[PDB]
């Protein structure tokens, strides 16, 4: 029955999306992904996924509100599930409303309007990839006396998130997700689909695919960065929650399969980290790197002493599977990096 179900995945080349599609194909779903070019789609179909159940459509700019109209006109009677993972390109700008906020909101509104136009009674489930940033501003992320849950919202306004590039990016995620819930509320009787959102913290984990022989490109930066720093190199400053990419992918799939996930914001978060946390874990699990990478200041910079606590009890109860912990993430991520460089 899964092969009788077509799932549309926007932004199919992405880090999260590739794991979603791998998992979907492993469950014998029919998948149409959207890609920015024929060469990317072909590389995906024939070098990465290698499946007759993966098709692709070209969608170049999700800031265009009509970007998904051709897809749903062509396939509007077949797509039962939409996993909307695509985000606008993030680039340096000082015009945050024009270059960040408006494209992010249109990036959500567009595909929903396409569904309303061409597939209102066919699409049964939509899952939108959102962000921890819809739950908190950057300015509210470092309050050890507060608490963030799935019902928390980033409190910034359209105007005050524009003070700086990271805060504006956080605001773009907030307003993009708000647009999804607002669309659903305004169209409750016009469209059939049920909506959930998957809202991840900082994403760690192994690449779905590595092409060998290459400098290795990795989709989550900080672990690969630390692995390649020398002993005396100055340390980056990075603190957030962490979540494995494969758990995010699995959550998206449950979020269209399971009726208990309907209408929920799912906070995809396994634990807190600072760079010290990562160094401690990497040094412990990879003897070959001790004395080669930084040690940092073990015991300093505990994330509990810096970050607003995150309580995602609801999400963990509803998803019903155990998130990978930091040790597993570091083992899988670092061993993939080291083996790939060994092979090249």
UniProtKB/TrEMBL annotation:
It comes from the Eukaryota. Pfam families: 3Beta_HSD. InterPro entries: 3Beta_OHSteriod_DH/Estase, NAD(P)-bd_dom_sf, NAD(P)_dehydrat-like. GO terms for biological process: steroid biosynthetic process. Residues 9-258 form the 3-beta hydroxysteroid dehydrogenase/isomerase domain. NADPH binds at residues 15-16, 40, 61-62, 85, 169, 173, 203. GO terms for molecular function: nucleotide binding; oxidoreductase activity, acting on the CH-OH group of donors, NAD or NADP as acceptor. Gene3D superfamilies: NAD(P)-binding Rossmann-like Domain. Keywords: Nucleotide-binding, Oxidoreductase. The keyword Cell inner membrane does not apply. CDD domains: AR_SDR_e. The keyword rRNA-binding does not apply. Belongs to the NAD(P)-dependent epimerase/dehydratase family. Dihydroflavonol-4-reductase subfamily. PANTHER family: NAD DEPENDENT EPIMERASE/DEHYDRATASE, STEROL-4-ALPHA-CARBOXYLATE 3-DEHYDROGENASE, DECARBOXYLATING. This is NADPH-dependent methylglyoxal reductase GRE2. The lineage of its organism: Eukaryota, Fungi, Dikarya, Ascomycota, Saccharomycotina.
